[model samples]
Target: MCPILWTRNGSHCYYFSMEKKDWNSSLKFCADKGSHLLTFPDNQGVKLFGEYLGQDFYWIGLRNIDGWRWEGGPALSLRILTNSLIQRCGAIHRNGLQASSCEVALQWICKKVLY
Candidate 1:
């Protein structure tokens, strides 16, 4: 059986500990839950998540497109953690370790809790 992660954040549940898959698959996994991978709620979201993880690296459901924007944008106007150049890829950790393209398969943080 595949591992199942349990993450409860606010009105949404999140999972951050998954083996490496790819970026696309991770996004779909979260979408199947009726939510995107993960996006920093706000300043609070960043702060809270940073606190929860207690580590410098964590995955949030966000990636860089033509223009810098969160995949779940319009709903989650995330504060771009990475600067302009860094915005083109999804971050596995706040420090910028793994760069996930839209097609790359990677394990991602899933949102089970919803607002």
Candidate 2:
């Protein structure tokens, strides 16, 4: 199991340790956490997360689905979050967030729900 990740707000927590699985695998990880992959409802959220972690990488809920559409909580696309290049079959990371195979061992964060 990977270490758990908690949002600074203390309202939401998450985990991010996987074997560099595909998008679907990442999605399942989030689901296991009782939530979905991270999704930036707005750039403000993006900025908040980026600043919160003092970095710009993590697995998000956004993923390429249906040939080009990124699914998970209101599907989106590569064009939607323009400039952010993420792969179609990998985990999400910061500093040029993208997808990678799930077989590689890497550091990841997990989320936990808080009251």
Candidate 3:
């Protein structure tokens, strides 16, 4: 289990950041906290997190790694919020999925996997 301050779901703990940072920086930030950028396990996870995040673009762990996949997972269902030829990072935009520029600074969500 994670600390009570974090949002818990089963064996995972999620944290939402108020500050903004680029994709790589955000990834490093989460890594420093013993976590990784947010990656919803399923559609329900997506819906829950969407509700938690009202209306703002936030970075997620998904990106164009070997054909649009989560940070450490295989490619799954795909959706886009705003299309861009330069943006390669994944984010939650308007409470849905989107791909934004990796250099774009945005609030981010981090998640920790508990044993």
TM-score order, best first, reads 3, 1, 2
- Residues 1-115 of candidate 2 have per-residue lDDT tens digits of 2233444345765555535444555667767767666664342344344444534345555555454333444444333333334435333333334554433333444444565
For residues 43-68, could you state the per-residue lDDT of candidate 3 as single tens digits?
33576557766778889888875667
Q: Number of the top candidate by lDDT?
A: 3
* Cα-based TM-score, every candidate: 0.62, 0.52, 0.82
- What TM-score should be assigned to candidate 1? 0.62
lDDT scores for all predictions?
0.54, 0.47, 0.79
Candidate 1 lDDT by residue in tens digits, 57-91:
44556555555445656433444445335435565
Ten-residue segment with the worst summed lDDT in candidate 2?
77-86
Considering TM-score, which of the candidate structures 1 and 2 is the better prediction for this target? 1
Roughly what TM-score does model 3 have, to 2 decimal places? 0.82
The lDDT-based order of candidates, best leading, equals 3, 1, 2
- Whichever of 1 and 2 has more lDDT, that candidate is 1
Runs off by more than 4 Å, candidate 1: 1-4, 41-44, 54-56, 74-87, 92-106
RMSD after CA superposition, every candidate: 4.9, 5.3, 2.3
lDDT of 3 at 26: 94
